[PDB]
């Protein structure tokens, strides 16, 4: 009970907000503001309040406590979970994707109120129903992907061709400097250059060599802005797809073996996070199709 300390300042700040809030209600009672405008300003004001109390709690906590140790380390949990365990929960999705005007002001440590628990439940069951559905759809998608992706097996040691594919080695280069791509790993790593590269008249990255940290670092240092990687798309193999174009596998960290089933592996990997995605528009916004 003494581990999770609610921020002392919270009460003060929130009552200030609440004070401000009731003023709006007063100036809504006289008809000077439309109900929709009141709802919008209130949702914005409570978003501000919950963000501010989140920051206040983040400052409050000392680094030596259990929850910080097991969240910062990446062991388990996440910042927002501690936010709604210690700080106020905030805006909660009303049924059929709406927001309420009076979000939850108490933390799970302090204990919700009856209606507050009731509104939180409105979102909780929806989430469970949604997950059950997303698992179903993810399974269906995985089956379709595996079916369409089968019959693609690696059946040649080396491709006959030299055509490659142009990918961005490095981008978002600030002024007077070269900056590598933010998502360089998922795109260009584990690919084999179709042809060598010369920048100072000397070969930097030899051909048919999978790329890693040292080589990519060297190539960005030399200042090359693009790269030409051989890839499965440009494969010209008389039988299936060659090993060279697929590049090294990933579960082993070595060149893909002849006869491995890349198709089922790709389908399984693409279908695996289908259950983990679980994302949806927070609110329709009153417009359909936008």
């Amino acid at each position: 009970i003494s581990d999770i300390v609610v921020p002392d300042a919270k009460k003060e700040i929130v009552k200030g907000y609440e004070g401000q809030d009731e003023k709006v209600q007063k100036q809504y009672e006289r008809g000077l503001i439309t109900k929709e405008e009141r709802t919008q300003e209130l949702i914005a004001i409570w978003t501000k309040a919950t963000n501010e109390v989140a920051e206040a709690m983040n400052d409050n906590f000392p680094k030596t406590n259990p929850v910080s140790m097991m969240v910062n380390s990446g062991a388990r949990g996440n910042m927002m979970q501690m936010r709604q365990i210690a700080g106020m929960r905030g805006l909660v999705s009303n049924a059929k994707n709406e927001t309420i005007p009076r979000p939850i002001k108490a933390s799970f440590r302090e204990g919700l109120s009856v209606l507050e628990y009731f509104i939180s439940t409105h979102g909780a069951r929806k989430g469970l129903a949604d997950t059950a559905l997303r698992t179903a759809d993810s399974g269906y998608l995985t089956r379709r992907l595996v079916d369409v992706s089968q019959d693609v097996i690696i059946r040649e040691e080396d491709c006959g061709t030299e055509r490659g594919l142009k990918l961005p080695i490095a981008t978002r280069d600030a002024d007077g400097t070269l900056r590598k791509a933010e998502d360089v790993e998922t795109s260009v790593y584990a690919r084999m250059l179709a042809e060598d590269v010369v920048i100072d008249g000397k070969v930097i990255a030899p051909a048919n060599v999978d790329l890693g940290d040292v080589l990519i670092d060297a190539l960005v240092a030399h200042g090359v802005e693009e790269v030409k990687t051989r890839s499965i798309l440009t494969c010209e193999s008389q039988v299936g797809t060659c090993a060279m174009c697929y590049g090294r596998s990933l579960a082993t960290g070595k060149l893909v073996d002849i006869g491995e089933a890349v198709g089922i592996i790709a389908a399984q990997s693409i279908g695996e996070p289908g259950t983990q995605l679980t994302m949806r528009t927070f609110h329709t916004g009153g417009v359909a199709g936008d």
Binding site: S2, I85, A95, F118, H122, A124, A261, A267
Partner: protein
């Protein structure tokens, strides 16, 4: 007074209304259906009290519905005036033991009256046995306890839906009249800027043809409807005119292929809607349609009228044209607005009474058809009420009602709370209702209307999430079928001690406050500002004297299983869901103990359930004993309660009952005399309370798994009886009869050591897998001795006899001490099904102790498998040596967002070591002193209601002021953590650790059930692959995703063997077994058999699927 044992209450607000009879839903519904003395007593009590109630019973109503039958001549008539019951012949205990459906006779007086004879002949007839419902709301059918659960259905009436079509770029409005029984009708306006009607959606048609088909003329039509341009446009574009023209046109459209007939068209239209039989709108249907359409007092019971149809036209178009308020046709002014189906005013529960009433109504409909047919084929003066009625349909329906019904469910007796929860569930799935495949997002999701009428917290987490839910705590059923809920009455800002039951619609009009809102010393509101809720689930506040109703109890929105949890408010809704769903599985233990910390409502949840045996008189006990207890009232009546002892439940757990009362103690009515499974002093007890400490420990409690001492194994703390029952029949076959005998053939001598004289295992003979329970031998089989068998028999001189052994044997992997054997004999007076000469059942009972794999869990949805059972020494003990009985991963509680369990642990520690608080002059001290929970002795239970639980200031102060347990020091620091000396390395843990008492249950996911294995066993017939299930030695399924993974690995040989040798190849299985035992290398797999099945089947569709080789025909 002494109703329950003392339990300190941490509540802060006094409660006017007590919880109603928690089982009222079933008992009152079935009393109404029976219309017995209790129901009519309730009816007259309500009438003299002024409360509305249906004055007419359920059975007599359905009887009176069937008017006396009239032949084409209408000469004769059969009146079913009076119905009556007689006491059932079989006792409830007798029915359960002898496999008889608990039922009683139902007689009825049939009066035959014929005008031609001018005579009345009265005679009583008997329509069959009627399954009755015991006083604990279970139908004991075929010796098994079923329960019928309510059903959520859209009430009949009008429903208007407003939507938007992207193609049209404009709003669309539709209407649907949903009847109770008849065919359905719809009314869509401006589908393409015109209004049209769906008469069962047969074909496209207009409204003008419908109105003209009715007697209403065009002139009056346009006079009434000249103010809405949509209808004038529809009228003018309609070229057809005249009633006859419209009628013949609509008949041709509805039934093409024959020339139109005026009279047949009129009778068809009358039959489809106006007929009182084909369109019998339920009483709720009319009751809601009059309110919705605004007509003032239409016909109380009957079909829709043309007046209703025109009123619906007017309402629909008023909605379309945009006006929000309009004069109701033949009614007062009303808001015209779209109505959402999901609102709970539109949802109706079919209590068991209405379900069985519908079924018996269908049966009587078949009876009516049968008697009418008999009348058409019978001569006069040879007709008596005795002979004409065939009772087969009614009995066949009320018996098939229980079977093949999604609503007659096998009762679950895992514990009394599982019983109550199965009673109160309102299953949306079932006939004529929302099915699994029809499920959508909207129906499952909680609605604002659900508050107080359907707990949103608890529901199965499976694919049927939210479809099945438990009724609220205070819920009561409106006679039409809607769900009520109480509210206290407020006036001039003063809360009054009056309660009114509001339904799901009357709630919307008013504004409802919150019970939690503080109240001053006087009955006025302490604070002008008070949270309230209003129409549409709004939560806006309204200060000052404006409210009129407030919730009577803060626990209104929570059901019984969810009300059990303590510190519920602090848990996330998801973890509360899991905790409440789990708690319907805890098995009773050898010695049940009430939780140290728990909601104060557990006493009601225990007493209300029918497992506890309470007294119906206020007397003095005279003979207390294990089997039975005798009570004597001052009047003189003696009654001996017979307590069940170790009798199997539905799920296979003991139902042992203890005895709590002393010899001469005084008793009061309803008081608890004998304790039940998972109970203590009449209070609920589904588990024990262990000493829990939160710390990771060597990784044995990694990923939420559990570590517990050997103290629980040693001291029998967590151990459960389990009684399994399996039976055999000595059936007579063509070749001969089966003999239950001790002389089993082709057996050793010592196997039949403990068998009794006739071939029955003795009572108390501990058994293991493979033991012979009851001996049985086949009469004969045509034996053609093989050459090897012939030669061997010749060498050893043994006679292989026609009689063959087929005796029942203990299933593999099973242990236990037999406790009771039952035998039923054909030749004896006992009745058996045909063919089975003798039946034998044996009870094997064991005491399963808490072991590795046996699932364990707490109350707040924290659950895990045991990973290791350390010796008592290795447990990290406390400063005073008390070894912590169980460890738990702390990594759980933050991420799972169930910090209620930490509060529970601290409060349990507080409960175990009492506290004294007197004259402390602290705010929390003042609150506890006024509540009365200031001076608490050690060990006493403590209660924190589900929403008025102890505040954190109270816990902090009490921890500061705990009673010194030994030598004058408190082992727990003010922070709620204590010093833990690691038992293994010995060296104290570097920092204090949280410790306290947590209530842990033993779930029914015991490892002994889950554990299964298979070398080789049975197989299926149509396809030779192994069969599934544990009872039949069934291999686990190597489904599609498994072969996907194996193909991904590239391991092709393993896939080949897993798909051909290890199943689906008859030639390969014996070969692989022989190869392994002989040590020879595995042989080459053949072609599987399932592919051959497919080839033949596709050859039976006239597709010549020919397997071919590159060089001509292939070899197979």
């Amino acid at each position: 007074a002494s109703t329950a044992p003392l339990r300190i209450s941490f509540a802060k607000i006094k409660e006017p209304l007590e919880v109603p009879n928690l089982l009222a839903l079933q008992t009152e519904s079935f009393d109404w259906l029976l219309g017995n003395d209790a129901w009519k007593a309730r009816v007259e009590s309500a009438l003299e009290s002024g409360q509305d109630v249906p004055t007419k019973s359920g059975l007599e109503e359905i009887f009176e519905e069937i008017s006396p039958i009239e032949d084409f001549s209408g000469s004769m008539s059969l009146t079913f005036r009076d119905h009556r019951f007689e006491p059932p012949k079989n006792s409830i205990d007798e029915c359960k033991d002898r496999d008889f459906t608990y039922a009683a006779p139902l007689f009825v007086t049939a009066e035959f009256t014929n005008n031609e004879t001018g005579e009345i002949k009265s005679q009583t007839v008997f329509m069959g046995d009627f399954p009755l419902m015991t006083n604990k709301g279970t139908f004991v059918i075929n010796g098994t306890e079923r329960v019928v659960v309510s059903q959520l259905v859209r009430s009949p009436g009008v429903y208007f839906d407003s939507s938007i079509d992207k193609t049209s770029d404009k709003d669309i409005f539709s209407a649907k009249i949903i009847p109770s029984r008849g065919a359905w009708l719809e009314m869509e306006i401006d589908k393409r800027d015109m209004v049209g009607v769906r008469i069962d959606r047969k074909r496209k048609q207009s409204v003008t043809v419908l109105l003209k088909a009715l007697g209403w003329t065009t002139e009056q039509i346009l006079e009434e409807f000249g103010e809405y341009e949509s209808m004038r446009a529809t009228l003018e574009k309609d070229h057809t005119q005249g009633q006859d023209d419209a009628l013949l046109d609509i008949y041709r459209k509805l039934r093409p292929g024959e020339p139109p007939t005026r009279e047949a068209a009129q009778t068809l239209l009358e039959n489809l809607y106006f007929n009182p039989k084909r369109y019998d709108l339920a009483k709720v249907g009319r009751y809601k349609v009059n309110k919705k359409l605004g007509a003032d007092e239409p016909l109380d019971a009957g079909v829709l009228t043309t007046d209703d149809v025109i009123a619906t036209i007017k309402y629909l178009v008023k909605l379309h044209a945009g006006e929000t308020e309009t004069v109701g046709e033949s009614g007062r002014e009303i808001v015209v607005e779209t109505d959402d189906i999901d609102h709970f005013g539109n949802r109706r529960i079919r209590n068991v009474g209405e379900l069985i009433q519908n079924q018996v109504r269908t049966g009587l409909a078949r009876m009516e058809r049968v008697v009418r047919e008999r009348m058409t084929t019978q001569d006069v003066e040879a007709i008596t009420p005795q002979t004409l009625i065939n009772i087969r349909p009614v009995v066949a329906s009320i018996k098939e009602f229980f079977g093949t019904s999604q609503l007659s469910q096998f009762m679950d007796q895992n514990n009394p709370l599982s019983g109550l929860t199965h009673k109160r569930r309102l299953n949306a799935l079932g006939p004529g209702g929302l099915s699994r495949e029809r499920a959508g997002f909207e129906v499952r999701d909680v609605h604002p209307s659900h508050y107080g009428r359907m707990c949103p917290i608890e529901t199965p987490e499976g694919p049927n999430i939210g479809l099945i839910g438990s009724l609220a705590s205070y819920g009561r059923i409106n006679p039409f079928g809607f769900i009520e809920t109480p509210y206290r009455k407020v006036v001039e800002g003063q809360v009054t001690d009056d309660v009114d039951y509001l339904t799901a619609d009357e709630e919307d009009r008013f504004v409802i406050a919150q019970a939690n809102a503080a109240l001053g010393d006087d009955m006025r509101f302490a604070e002008a500002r008070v949270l309230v809720r209003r129409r549409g689930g709004e939560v806006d506040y309204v200060p000052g004297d404006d409210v009129d109703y407030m919730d009577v109890s803060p626990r209104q929105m929570v059901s019984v299983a969810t009300a059990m949890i303590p510190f519920l408010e602090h848990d996330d809704a998801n973890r509360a869901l899991m905790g409440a769903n789990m708690m319907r599985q805890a098995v009773p233990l050898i010695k049940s103990e009430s939780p140290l910390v728990g909601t104060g409502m557990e006493y009601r949840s225990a007493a209300d359930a029918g497992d506890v045996v309470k007294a119906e008189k206020a007397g003095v006990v005279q003979e207390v004993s294990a089997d039975y207890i005798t009570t004597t009232n001052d009047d003189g009546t003696y009654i001996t309660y017979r307590l069940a002892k170790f009798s199997r439940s539905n799920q296979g757990t003991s139902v042992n009952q203890k005895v709590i009362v002393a010899e001469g103690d005084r008793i009061i009515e309803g008081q608890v005399l004998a304790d039940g499974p998972a109970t203590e002093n009449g209070e609920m007890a589904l588990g024990k309370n262990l000493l829990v400490a939160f710390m990771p420990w060597e990784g044995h409690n990694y990923e939420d798994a559990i570590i517990l001492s050997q103290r629980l194994v040693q001291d029998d703390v967590l151990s459960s009886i389990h009684i399994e029952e399996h039976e055999v029949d000595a059936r007579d076959t063509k070749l001969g009869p089966e003999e239950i005998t001790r002389d089993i053939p082709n057996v050793s001598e010592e196997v039949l050591a403990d068998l009794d004289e006739r071939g029955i295992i003795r009572i108390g003979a501990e058994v293991v897998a493979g033991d012979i329970l009851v001996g049985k031998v086949t009469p004969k089989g045509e034996t053609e001795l093989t050459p090897e068998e012939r030669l061997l028999r010749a060498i050893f001189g043994e006679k292989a006899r026609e009689v063959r052994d087929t005796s029942l044997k203990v299933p593999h992997g099973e242990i236990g001490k037999v406790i009771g054997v039952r035998v039923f004999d054909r030749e004896e007076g006992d009745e058996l099904p045909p063919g089975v000469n003798q039946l034998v059942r044996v009870y094997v009972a064991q005491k399963r102790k808490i072991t590795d794999g046996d699932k364990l869990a707490g109350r707040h949805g924290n659950k895990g498998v045991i990973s290791k059972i350390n010796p008592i020494e290795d447990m990290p003990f406390l400063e005073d040596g008390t070894p912590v009985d169980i460890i738990l991963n702390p990594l759980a509680v933050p991420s799972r967002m169930n910090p209620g369990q930490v509060l529970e642990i601290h409060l349990g520690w507080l409960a175990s070591r009492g506290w004294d608080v007197s004259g402390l002059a602290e705010e929390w001290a003042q609150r506890l002193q006024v509540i009365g929970a200031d001076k608490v002795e050690p060990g006493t239970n403590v209660a924190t209601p589900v929403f008025d639980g102890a505040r954190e200031d109270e816990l902090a102060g009490l921890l500061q002021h705990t009673i010194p347990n030994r030598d004058g020091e408190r082992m727990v620091l003010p922070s709620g953590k204590a010093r833990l000396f690691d038992g293994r390395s010995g060296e104290p843990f570097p920092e204090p650790i949280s410790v306290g008492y947590m209530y842990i249950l033993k779930l029914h996911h015991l490892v002994d059930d889950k554990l299964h294995a298979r070398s080789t066993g049975p197989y299926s017939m149509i396809t030779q692959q192994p069969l599934g299930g544990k009872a039949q030695f069934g291999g686990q399924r190597f489904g599609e995703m498994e072969v996907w993974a194996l193909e991904a690995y590239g391991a092709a040989y393993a896939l080949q063997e897993l798909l051909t040798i290890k199943s689906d190849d008859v030639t390969g299985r014996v070969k692989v077994y022989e190869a392994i035992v002989k040590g020879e290398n595995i042989p080459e797999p053949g072609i599987p058999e399932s592919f051959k099945v497919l080839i033949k089947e596709m050859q039976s569709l006239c597709l010549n699927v020919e397997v071919l080789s590159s060089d001509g025909m292939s070899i197979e």
